[PDB]
Amino acid sequence: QPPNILLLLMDDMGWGDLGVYGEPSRETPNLDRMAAEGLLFPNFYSANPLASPSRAALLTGRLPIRNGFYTTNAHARNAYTPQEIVGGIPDSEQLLPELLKKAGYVSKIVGKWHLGHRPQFHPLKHGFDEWFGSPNCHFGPYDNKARPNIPVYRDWEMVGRYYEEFPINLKTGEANLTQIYLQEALDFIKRQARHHPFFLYWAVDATHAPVYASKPFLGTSQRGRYGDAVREIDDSIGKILELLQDLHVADNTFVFFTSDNGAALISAPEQGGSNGPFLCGKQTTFEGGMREPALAWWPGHVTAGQVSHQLGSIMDLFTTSLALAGLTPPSDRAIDGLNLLPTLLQGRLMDRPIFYYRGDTLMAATLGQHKAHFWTWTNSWENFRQGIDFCPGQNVSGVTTHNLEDHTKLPLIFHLGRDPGERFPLSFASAEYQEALSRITSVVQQHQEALVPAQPQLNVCNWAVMNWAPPGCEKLGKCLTPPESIPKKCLW
């Protein structure tokens, strides 16, 4: 029997949000015990600065440039899957649960999908057997004329909407959702143990603004509401882990914890996380935007309380989980995800690159201890003047710029070991600069010449495709009449 796979994917949590990672308030005892009982990655990365493209990247093991989760409307624009998006995960893409099904797995997604809300993009059409969660954010409450409230699904059909059947109180921050997500996870694990190997994609989002937590966890954190959520998610994760041990299926269960992108610094200090020593956060390709916590837990297989400086990618969990199940990745396409079993079980290292993409643009690349910035950008001057700051309290001369700066000819290079916060660019005349530049450009060109970008899915929007009448609305009497609209270019 192949080992169970449990993937814990957080939403907008940063490198500095875990106790073991150096959070001052030390409010994550369960994840801290998971680290003590496993392996911690200090140099792990997501595939994009925001949600959709990263989640697609996890599930495909492929860069958003490859899987289609980007825009070409303008260069280097962050795009995702809002209610009005026309595109979504293509049928050509082979998702992890589709393939695991080859080894007898039974797979469940809990929480946020974000790979398309239209019927053709349903996760049960793309490998998953069961679902409880929403295809979108939990933003609202909407007036149901201009926008409809975001639906929560059980499997094929909606069972309610956020701010309706599933209340979120914005004043207090109260919502029972994380407790339902917990309960879905426990029950699933209970039905599958000793029957079939299971795959659980536990993609919670209480940590996405507007932040929420159940009543018992409200006002317990020193981090305000955002920490309340983090404390609940942590408590929940402890209980998920204890159940694996109480069923003696822990030795045959591989669990991995990570986050889809950096902390949402527009929402700090109350509703956003911490990126620790790193620069900026979500929306950018600086370290704080794409470096993530990363714990691996597999009693008896992964040696307890170790550290690996393996450069890791969220995409690696695609290939690894396949290797865990004794399968091979698709041989008819480029696969970015690497098999990390040699790192996880033997403590070996691998000299791989980390590409930092923002929209249609490779912004930056990391080999070893060096990161080269070919393009730099926080947000435009117009957005900055309107009070949107992606890098609050932070300003690095000629690095954190409000123009999309072209450094393709003469990249801004950092030594991450010496300078994790990307504060001091290497001098252009130095030998260390030259050695890195050659090493990094070599891998980048190679990548780019072998790269045929996919057709972009995130270019077109249409008011009429919003969740007006999800499947199951008729029986609940919750279908809404949609407005009259045409498809047009999304304004990003």
Ligand X SMILES: CC(=O)N[C@@H]1[C@@H](O)[C@@H](O)[C@@H](CO)O[C@H]1O
Ligand Y SMILES: *[C@@H]1O[C@H](CO)[C@@H](O)[C@H](O)[C@H]1NC(C)=O
Q: Report the C-alpha gap between 397 and 282 in whole angstroms.
A: 20
What would the two tokens of residue 24 be?
A: 């001052």
Which is nearer to ligand X, 26 or 75 (by Cβ)? 75
Contact present, 317 and 45 (Cβ < 8 Å): no
Please report whether residue 13 would count as binding ligand X according to CB under 6 A: no
Please report whether residue 226 would count as binding ligand X according to CB under 6 A: no
Which is nearer to ligand Y, 331 or 397 (by Cβ)? 397
Please report whether residue 114 would count as binding ligand X according to CB under 6 A: yes
Please report whether residue 284 would count as binding Ca ion according to CB under 5 A: no
Contact present, 6 and 253 (Cβ < 8 Å): yes
Residue from 157, 165, 174, 419 binding ligand Y (CB under 6 A): 174
Q: What is the x/- site pattern for ligand X, positions 181-220, by CB under 6 A? A: ---------------------------x------------
Contact present, 92 and 66 (Cβ < 8 Å): no
AA identity, residue 461: C
Q: Report the C-alpha gap between 406 and 129 in whole angstroms.
A: 46
End-to-end CA separation in angstroms for the chain: 47
Residue 387 touches which member of ligand Y, Ca ion, a copy of itself, none, C-beta under 5-8 Å by kind? none
For residue 95, CA distances in Å to 60, 152, 322 come to 5, 22, 11
Which is nearer to a copy of itself, 93 or 287 (by Cβ)? 287
Please report whether residue 261 would count as binding Ca ion according to CB under 5 A: yes
Please report whether residue 387 would count as binding ligand Y according to CB under 6 A: no
Helix (H) / strand (E) element for 35: namely helix 29-36
Residue 25 touches which member of ligand Y, ligand X, a copy of itself, none, C-beta under 5-8 Å by kind? a copy of itself
By CB neighbour count within 10 A (0-12 exposed, 13-18 middle, 19+ buried), where does 401 fall? middle
Which is nearer to a copy of itself, 5 or 209 (by Cβ)? 209
Shortest separation between residue 394's beta carbon and a copy of itself, angstroms: 6
Phi, psi of 246, rounded to the nearest 5 degrees: -65, -10
Phi, psi of 488, rounded to the nearest 5 degrees: -145, 170
Q: What is the x/- site pattern for Ca ion, positions 10-49, by CB under 5 A? A: -xx-------------------------------------
Contact present, 220 and 274 (Cβ < 8 Å): no
AA identity, residue 89: I
Phi, psi of 161, rounded to the nearest 5 degrees: -120, 150
Shortest separation between residue 172's beta carbon and a copy of itself, angstroms: 16
Please report whether residue 183 would count as binding ligand Y according to CB under 6 A: no
Please report whether residue 80 would count as binding ligand X according to CB under 6 A: yes
Shortest separation between residue 175's beta carbon and ligand Y, angstroms: 6
Q: Report the C-alpha gap between 122 and 97 in whole angstroms.
A: 13
Q: Report the C-alpha gap between 357 and 329 in whole angstroms.
A: 23
Shortest separation between residue 112's beta carbon and Ca ion, angstroms: 8
Residue 137 touches which member of Ca ion, ligand X, a copy of itself, none, C-beta under 5-8 Å by kind? ligand X
Contact present, 458 and 72 (Cβ < 8 Å): no
Q: Report the C-alpha gap between 237 and 252 in whole angstroms.
A: 18
Please report whether residue 211 would count as binding ligand Y according to CB under 6 A: no
As a three-state string, the secondary structure of 215-248 is HHHCCCCCCHHHHHHHHHHHHHHHHHHHHHHHCC
Contact present, 63 and 57 (Cβ < 8 Å): yes
Q: Report the C-alpha gap between 195 and 263 in whole angstroms.
A: 38
Q: What is the x/- site pattern for ligand X, positions 267-306, by CB under 6 A? A: ----------------x-----------------------
Please report whether residue 47 would count as binding ligand X according to CB under 6 A: no
Please report whether residue 380 would count as binding ligand Y according to CB under 6 A: no
Which is nearer to ligand Y, 171 or 195 (by Cβ)? 171
Which is nearer to ligand Y, 174 or 419 (by Cβ)? 174
Shortest separation between residue 290's beta carbon and ligand Y, angstroms: 22
384: left (phi over 0), alpha (psi -120 to 50) or beta: alpha
Q: Report the C-alpha gap between 418 and 291 in whole angstroms.
A: 16
Which is nearer to ligand Y, 177 or 372 (by Cβ)? 177
Contact present, 300 and 321 (Cβ < 8 Å): no
Shortest separation between residue 40's beta carbon and ligand X, angstroms: 25
Which is nearer to ligand Y, 167 or 471 (by Cβ)? 167
Which residues are near a copy of itself by CB under 8 A? 16, 19, 21-26, 42-43, 221-224, 227, 268-270, 274, 276-277, 279, 307, 309, 369, 392-396, 415-424
How many other C-beta atoms are found inside a 10 Å radius of the C-beta of residue 477? 6
Q: What is the x/- site pattern for ligand Y, positions 395-414, by CB under 6 A? A: x-x-----------------
Residue 114 touches which member of ligand X, Ca ion, a copy of itself, none, C-beta under 5-8 Å by kind? ligand X
> How do strand 151-154 and strand 157-161 relate by DSSP bridges?
antiparallel
Residues found near ligand Y in the complex (CB under 6 A): 167, 169, 174-176, 395, 397
Residues found near Ca ion in the complex (CB under 5 A): 11-12, 51, 260-261
Residues found near ligand X in the complex (CB under 6 A): 50-51, 78, 80, 112, 114, 137, 139, 208, 283
